[PDB]
Each structure stands twice: as structure tokens, then as C-alpha cells.
């Protein structure tokens, strides 16, 4: 059973701008997703300071980057607080509706796409290089769910039946045909040491054989 939702108009215009605007510094998407993972890890570690039972679903707090050249996917796995069905559907979009409006005002005032993180909408920068984004998350107070959208103005949410995660968020980027450079081991290295060198959690790059 899969439910299909319609993106808010402001968010839908933000993504379509991201995919269609000719912008060459697309490497900033990894900095935002890693920063999003660092925020999720800061939350779950902060809640465990007054409730250590929240870490029963996992004590390790790390970020994993798993490129796959066969499936043409780049995966970012973090063990943060996770996301609920209300967060995936509403809530998070309500928070981002103001950051989107302010972002589109700043692009016309001189700012570029690289400043998308300063508005709290840095996740949508994933569509700079991905034609389809799948999100698998697990929150301590909800079931495992699957978020998916190929832009177009709509997204789907369903209960995940795959391998359980315990807690955290898995972001799977189905990369575009011309963005396969972000699956190379030395390209992901350059981006991490240049953009996410000061993250307070271990960022492990999974190499392929
Ligand atoms: C930018 C934001 C925090 C809002 C939002 C809504 C739905 C999914 C995500 C995400 N997958 O990071 C998301 O990240």
C-alpha cells in the first residue's frame, strides 16, 4: 500500500528550479546531505542525555557513504534520530515552506544555489545530481517508512518491508547519467575533505571491489 502526495507549490517550484537551472558546482549536494546527517545525529545524542533508552536501537553515531556503480546509486546512511510519517509527509515541509520563499528571494538578489543550506532546505539540493531520491528512515516512535520522489510535483510514502535499520535515515540517490563522477572513490574524497572536514561524527567511505 503506497500513498501518493502532492508537494507544496513553493517546494515544487524550488525543485524544478534545482533540476533545470544550469549550475556547474553540483558537488555541494554532498555537503548538505552530510550536514543534514550531522543534525540528525546531534538530535538523537542530545535526547539520550536525559534518556539513554533512546539509544537501545543503536549506540553508534556515524555517517556512511556507499557508492554503487552497478545500480548507479550514491547512498548516505546515518544513525541519527530518524524520521516519522508526519515528518515525511507534513511537518518538515511546513518548516521548509518559509526557507524556500526566502531562498528564491535570495537567488534574485545575487545569491546562488550553493547557499541553499543557509535556508534549511539543503536536502532538495540532492536533485542537482539525482533524477530520483529514495529515503528509508526509522524513528524510535514510528515504523520504518520509505520516501520516494522523481520530482514532478509529487512524492510517495509507504511502509518499508526491506532490511530493518533500527534507527536513522538512508538516502539513496539515483544519479543522473551525466553525474556518475560522484561514484568515484577519489571524487567523494575531495568533496568530503573540502566541504565536510569539520563534522563531529565519523564519515566512512565504503569503497567498492
Ligand atoms: C530539508 C528537510 C529537513 C525537509 C525534508 C522533508 C522530507 C525529507 C527530507 C529528507 N529526506 O532529508 C527533508 O529534509
Curated annotation (Swiss-Prot):
Modified residues (N6-acetyllysine): 43, 69
Free-text note on domains in this protein's UniProt record: The TPR repeat-binding motif mediates interaction with TPR repeat-containing proteins like the co-chaperone STUB1.
Post-translational modification: ISGylated.
Annotated signal sequence range: none
Homology family: Belongs to the heat shock protein 90 family.
Residues noted as binding ATP in the record, renumbered to the chain: 36, 78, 97, 123
Name of the protein: Heat shock protein HSP 90-alpha
Disulfide linkage: none
Subunit details: Homodimer. Identified in NR3C1/GCR steroid receptor-chaperone complexes formed at least by NR3C1, HSP90AA1 and a variety of proteins containing TPR repeats such as FKBP4, FKBP5, PPID, PPP5C or STIP1. Forms a complex containing HSP90AA1, TSC1 and TSC2; TSC1 is required to recruit TCS2 to the complex. The closed form interacts (via the middle domain and TPR repeat-binding motif) with co-chaperone TSC1 (via C-terminus). Interacts with TOM34. Interacts with TERT; the interaction, together with PTGES3, is required for correct assembly and stabilization of the TERT holoenzyme complex.
Location within or outside the cell: Nucleus; Cytoplasm; Melanosome; Cell membrane
Residues covered by region (Interaction with NR3C1): 1-209
Protein function: Molecular chaperone that promotes the maturation, structural maintenance and proper regulation of specific target proteins involved for instance in cell cycle control and signal transduction. Undergoes a functional cycle that is linked to its ATPase activity which is essential for its chaperone activity. This cycle probably induces conformational changes in the client proteins, thereby causing their activation. Interacts dynamically with various co-chaperones that modulate its substrate recognition, ATPase cycle and chaperone function. (Microbial infection) Seems to interfere with N.meningitidis NadA-mediated invasion of human cells. Decreasing HSP90 levels increases adhesion and entry of E.coli expressing NadA into human Chang cells; increasing its levels leads to decreased adhesion and invasion.
Amino acid at each position: 500500500e503506497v500513498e501518493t502526495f502532492a508537494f507544496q507549490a513553493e517546494i515544487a517550484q524550488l525543485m524544478s528550479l534545482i533540476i533545470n537551472t544550469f549550475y556547474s558546482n553540483k558537488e555541494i549536494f554532498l555537503r548538505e546531505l552530510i550536514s543534514n546527517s550531522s543534525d540528525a545525529l546531534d538530535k538523537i545524542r542530545y535526547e539520550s542525555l536525559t534518556d539513554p533508552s533512546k539509544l537501545d536501537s543503536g549506540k553508534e553515531l556515524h555517517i556512511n557513504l556507499i557508492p554503487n556503480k552497478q545500480d548507479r546509486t550514491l547512498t548516505i546512511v546515518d544513525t541519527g534520530i530518524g524520521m516519522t510519517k508526519a515528518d515525511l509527509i507534513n511537518n518538515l515541509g511546513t518548516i521548509a515552506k518559509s526557507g524556500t520563499k526566502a531562498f528564491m528571494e535570495a537567488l534574485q538578489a545575487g545569491a546562488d544555489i550553493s547557499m541553499i543550506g543557509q535556508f534549511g532546505v539543503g536536502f532538495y539540493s540532492a536533485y542537482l545530481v539525482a533524477e530520483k531520491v529514495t529515503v528509508i528512515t526509522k524513528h524510535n516512535d514510528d515504523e520504518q517508512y520509505a520516501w520516494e520522489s522523481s520530482a514532478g510535483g509529487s512524492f510517495t510514502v509507504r511502509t518499508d518491508t526491506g532490511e530493518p535499520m533500527g534507527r536513522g535515515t538512508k538516502v539513496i540517490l539515483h544519479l543522473k547519467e551525466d553525474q556518475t563522477e560522484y561514484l568515484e572513490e577519489r571524487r567523494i574524497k575531495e568533496i568530503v575533505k573540502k566541504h565536510s572536514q569539520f563534522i563531529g561524527y565519523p564519515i566512512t567511505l565504503f569503497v567498492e571491489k
